[PDB]
Design a binder for this molecule. Structure first.
Ligand SMILES: O=C[C@H](O)[C@H](O)[C@H](O)COP(=O)(O)O
Ligand SMILES: O=C[C@H](O)[C@H](O)[C@H](O)COP(=O)(O)O
Lengths: 148, 148
């Protein structure tokens, strides 16, 4: 599958590691930037990844900033996007199983590298469980329709 | 300040503990439910808290589900809402300082009680730092205006 990835300067180094991780595993990676350590604004890169996932240009996306919070909040503003900030593999599994998340958000200043690779591996392998969880994802779509 | 609180059945027991906690500290708490352990849909309660914060009926809100993820994704679909799933006090502090979060999301199946009270104590005390962080919050507002 095609994984879009994006970060601010706060998640740039962890993004470099995950892009490498994913390519080694034979995923196609689209890197939406940022492309160095200079200060940039996490909403710009959250948006590029979220719109790539929404357009079907990427199948899913991973967004990284210092904590994961800002970039995931920004990505969740896009209708049809469910971005999950995960700090352990349990949350990552559940974000796929229950929330059908199509963006994984991570925080480079919170999770160390090997932990974050473990979360990514879990998230990429977990599967949506449907049922009552589809009903709940629909109700998330209803909120989007209300404020649309 | 007036704190709105809400959960599904997955965050109901932790909600009870936090409501008690906040009252002992002299916060006015508005409990949006749910009001027992029967299975319910986290988007309904994320929405109620988010709309209370948005109307000014509550100053800030706390939403709880099994992981915090579904309920905070739902809350983040409301314009003007910035809901932060935090699993430690550092993320809670940053969600205020940097993201000016007006909703704290927690996961009852992820954080134990005393940890979760520590995160809430931190979040309620932390202050927005403005500056470049206000510029970035504005860009989240721009995504909202785009998809409005
Ligand atoms: O959620 C926002 C992210 O954590 C950022 O990477 C962080 O706010 C940027 O902080 P600073 O401007 O001090 O690098
Ligand atoms: O993010 C969704 C929350 O984790 C819920 O509390 C959880 O999905 C509900 O799971 P179940 O229906 O098995 O109680």
């Amino acid at each position: 599958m095609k994984i879009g990835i994006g970060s601010d300067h706060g998640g740039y180094n962890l993004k470099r590691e995950i892009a490498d991780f994913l390519k080694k595993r034979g995923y196609e990676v689209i890197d939406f930037g940022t492309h160095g350590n200079e200060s940039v604004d996490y909403p710009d890169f959250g948006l590029k990844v979220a719109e790539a996932v929404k357009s079907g240009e990427c199948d899913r996306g991973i967004v990284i900033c210092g904590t994961g919070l800002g970039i995931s909040i920004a990505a969740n503003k896009v209708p049809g996007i469910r971005a999950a900030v995960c700090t352990n593999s349990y949350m990552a599994r559940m974000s796929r199983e229950h929330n059908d998340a199509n963006i994984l958000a991570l925080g480079e200043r919170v999770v160390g590298l090997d932990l974050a690779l473990d979360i990514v591996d879990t998230w990429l392998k977990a599967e949506f469980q449907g049922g009552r969880h589809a009903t709940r994802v629909g109700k998330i779509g209803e909120i989007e329709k209300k404020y649309s």
